[PDB]
Structure formats: C-alpha cells, structure tokens
Amino acid sequence: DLLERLGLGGRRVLILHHDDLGLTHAQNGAYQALGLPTGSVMVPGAWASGVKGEDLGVHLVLTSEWPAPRMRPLTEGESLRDEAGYFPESLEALWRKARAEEVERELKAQIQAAAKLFSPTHLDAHQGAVLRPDLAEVYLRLAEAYRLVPLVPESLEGLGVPPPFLPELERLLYETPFPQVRFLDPYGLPPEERLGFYLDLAHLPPGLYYLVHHSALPTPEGRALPDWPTREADYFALSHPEVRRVLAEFHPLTWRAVREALF
Amino acid sequence: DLLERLGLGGRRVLILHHDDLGLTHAQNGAYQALGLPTGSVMVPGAWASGVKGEDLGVHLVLTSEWPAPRMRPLTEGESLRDEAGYFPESLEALWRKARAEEVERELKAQIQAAAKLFSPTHLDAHQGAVLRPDLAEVYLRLAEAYRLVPLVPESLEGLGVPPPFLPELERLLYETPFPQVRFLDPYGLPPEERLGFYLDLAHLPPGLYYLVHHSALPTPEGRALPDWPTREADYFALSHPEVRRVLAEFHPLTWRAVREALF
Ligand SMILES: [Mg+2]
Ligand SMILES: [Mg+2]
C-alpha cells in the first residue's frame, strides 16, 4: 500500500540502512566511504557531529554495551544510568529500572539535538530498546510528534522479544497507521558467510525490505569493538562488485521519500 | 617549601603530565605505549572508561573545540551548552554565558564519575577554562572538598588570560595554600622542533616543573584531530631513548605523592 502510493507497487524495494553512525570514527568512515544514503546516528556518540548525508535518522539509545567507547544520557534522570552514569550495559538492566517519563525526556532530547546536526528523516532504536510496551508507545508517539518515520517491522518473530511483551506489542503494532517493513538482520550470522548473505538477496520475491548493516572501516579504533569482525564483513561485502550488482536489482528507497509521502 | 617537606629541596623535580586521555583511542594508546604514570582523563570522552594507571587525575572539561569528536555536559544546566547541546567551542563563548552554580554541578558530576573509573589524584582544567575568577574559586574549593591536588601555576604569563582577570587570579593565586608548579607546555611550538624542546630540558635549574604532553599514536582516528601532527610529535619525542635519558636526570614525582603530603 505504501509502495502503492509511491507508485512502486509489485516491485522489490530495498531500504539499506547503516546503523550506529556516530559511535566510532571507523563507522562514520565506512558511511563516508560506501557512498550510500541511509543511516541513523547515535546522538550520544562522540562522532555524532561528524556525519553528513541525505537520508539520516536518529538511532535512539538507552544502553551502552561495550567496555568502551561508552555513551552517557543527555538528560539527568537516574533511572537511565548505571552507575558510572553511563547507559546500562544490558536491555535487562534497562527494562528492569528505566521509568517511562525519564525515557521520554531523554528521547526528546536525543531527537532535538539531532535536528541541530542534520535533517532527521526517520527514527529507530539501538538494540530495539523501545521494545518494552510502555516505551514502544513513547517511540511511536514521538515519531508522529516530530513527523519522523519510525522503523516498524512487519512481524516481530525472530527479534527475541521477551514473551510477556508480545500481547501489547502485537496490539499497537496491529493498531499503527505506520508502514511496516520486511525486516532483515545479517547480524548474529558468522562473518565469513556475510558475502553470501548479501548475494542471496537476489532471491527475494517482490516486497518492501529493510536491511540493516553495521559497516565499519578496518581500524585500530574499530578493532577495539568486540563485534568488529562482523562490522568489517558488512563493509567488505557491501564494497564487493558482485554485491553491488545484486543491490542494483532493487529499487532503492530512502526514508526521506517515505516521509514526504506520509507527512 | 613543598619540595622541602617532600625532602626534595634543591633537586630538579619533574611532573610529566599526559593530557586529554579519554579523548581518543589514539591518546589512550599513547598512554599505554609510554608506560608513564601521570595524566588526566576527560570524563565526557568516549574513551574515558578505557584507561587505567597509577597517577590519574580528572581533566575537567567545559569546552569542545573540534567539529568532532565533540563532548556533552553530564548535567543539564543550560548555560553550559550551545545550541546543539555541546560544550561551547571557545573560552569566549563559554565565559560569556556559563553560570557558576551550574559549572559547579557539572564539575562535581565529572569528579564523581571519574571516581567510579579510577583513583583520581589531581584536578586540572582543559584549555584552562577555570581561569574566569569566579570559576577558579569553584575549582579550588572542589580540589579541597575531594582531597585532590589542583593544577596551580607559578606565573600566569602567556596563558592568554583576559587582562581584567589578572587582578583576582593573582589575589587568590597568592592566598591559596596549594603548591604552585613551574608550568611548561611545548603546545604552540612547531612539530618538527619538539624533539629539541625535550632535549633542552637538560638545561633546567632545580625547581618544581610541570610538563604537559598530548602524546597520541599515529591512527586514522587520531588524525581526525586537526592538531595531530603535534600530538604525534610528543609521542615520538617521549619514546626517544635520548629524551628518556634526559628525563631520567629529573626526580620523577607523582601527583599521588604530592597528595599524601598535603591531605
Ligand atoms: Mg545500534
Ligand atoms: Mg586538554
């Protein structure tokens, strides 16, 4: 239906989405190098203010998992920090303690700060931290309020949602006027199979797909991150002429385009 | 006096101090590489939590000069930010708006957070942002209140202090019980001369010298900073066997030692 109103009905369309921009110099590096429009920036990242592009969104953050670099909240609510004053290292920690009003403040802050740095087009969430029903409600409400399109998957099977969340999630997912995407995450999959993952996209039937990558340049700074092998594999696969050819087979779509059509 | 009560009267004594640790993975790297005890850590830095060593202080920040990486206030006082929510880019921007109560909350916050990551022995200020009289007062009160020795220089010549501040700064510089160091900074002097500057320390009389360096390791992330040539120059100087030998002729003194002697 969305594809319909974009006159793209029946086509295979692809939103290729670069995550975790602003987190390291290497990530921004890859974003610059790769030449593709779409990503979202982590406003608390040190390099958040080093990124520029045509299809940029705000990657909302409420957790900081790595030993380093770590990020700190913008606002001063206690429920959001753990306890060097960084965001919690795990979702479990977050979901157990964060109060909704404190979260909402923090996200409002993140969005407004972003809007001082590029023109945000969309909104999504690192580690799907907005998965607590509670917050998911905040997330969608915010997206509407700021006229930014949120990332909504068609189904939440395979996202490891905690089961007690399902009933209410399913609930407002079903109730949302927002377009849903067919979600794809090659994160979790072994680095050496990444190439083949991207090459196999050639086999997908028509439909609107959302594929996320975490490309980072191979760098000493980058290798301080535990998941670097998977971040580099994204980067090399995307630069591989075969993959570039496969990707060309999709009509490429930006959130900017989608936003024009909803707001 | 202080040299006297350390039983060091008459000696050539050096505090060698590594600045901006926590700023980049290249700085932290240089600290490790150099194996020397003393530096201080920019707590709002992304790599703040990646450093450990025996003589670490908190490098307080109230300004973020580069276009990236940039740093944000821990607390949410309005007078500390600019208008993207970063620390302002110049002393001038800062001094014309910062409130003292807010600065106090902020530096307090930065101190608390540093305690969580290591055992702080001292206190200094990035770009000497505490030079506004007002805030210099704040700064020494806090050094008191947390039993950390503050950076206090002997002369304030060539630190570009706005002239109308000299009177008040001279007053409290005069009244403070805290020991004053003989400030040396090769920051300013051309990268290719640097090796010279370090060797010419051979020619220094007895006294208490504070030498600040910004050593950083050759790195794509490091070189994202405009002043990298001089950062890397410090590193190559201090890792040169000649310069280590000349530094040997000094009695190395940690801020830690100073702290026991005074608290
Ligand atoms: Mg993420
Ligand atoms: Mg500094």
GROMACS .gro file of C-alpha atoms in nm, chain B residues 19-20 40 42 59-66 70-71 87-95 124-132 151 159-162 183 185 187 212 214 227 231:
model
   44
  282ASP     CA    1   4.657   1.547   2.889
  283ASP     CA    2   4.322   1.466   2.717
  303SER     CA    3   4.431   1.319   3.346
  305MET     CA    4   3.833   1.391   3.003
  322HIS     CA    5   4.096   1.669   3.324
  323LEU     CA    6   3.778   1.881   3.373
  324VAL     CA    7   3.610   1.996   3.059
  325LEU     CA    8   3.381   2.290   2.988
  326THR     CA    9   3.458   2.336   2.617
  327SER     CA   10   3.454   2.126   2.299
  328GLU     CA   11   3.674   2.297   2.028
  329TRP     CA   12   3.679   2.047   1.741
  333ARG     CA   13   3.265   1.675   2.050
  334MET     CA   14   3.178   1.632   2.424
  350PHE     CA   15   3.008   2.237   2.533
  351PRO     CA   16   3.084   2.558   2.360
  352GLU     CA   17   3.364   2.571   2.108
  353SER     CA   18   3.561   2.865   2.258
  354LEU     CA   19   3.655   3.004   2.603
  355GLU     CA   20   3.491   3.321   2.480
  356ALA     CA   21   3.158   3.155   2.408
  357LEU     CA   22   3.186   2.984   2.745
  358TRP     CA   23   3.293   3.273   2.970
  387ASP     CA   24   4.321   2.014   3.606
  388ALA     CA   25   4.115   2.206   3.350
  389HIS     CA   26   4.107   2.158   2.979
  390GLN     CA   27   4.209   2.480   2.796
  391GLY     CA   28   4.224   2.639   3.147
  392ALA     CA   29   3.851   2.706   3.126
  393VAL     CA   30   3.860   2.769   3.501
  394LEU     CA   31   4.054   3.096   3.456
  395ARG     CA   32   3.738   3.305   3.492
  414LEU     CA   33   4.698   2.235   3.894
  422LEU     CA   34   4.827   3.179   2.915
  423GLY     CA   35   4.628   3.449   2.734
  424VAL     CA   36   4.420   3.537   3.041
  425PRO     CA   37   4.178   3.822   2.956
  446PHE     CA   38   5.437   2.530   3.403
  448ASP     CA   39   5.394   2.343   2.756
  450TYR     CA   40   5.194   2.300   2.275
  475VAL     CA   41   5.223   1.869   2.992
  477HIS     CA   42   4.943   1.538   2.442
  490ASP     CA   43   4.635   1.914   1.588
  494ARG     CA   44   5.025   1.508   1.941
   0.00000   0.00000   0.00000
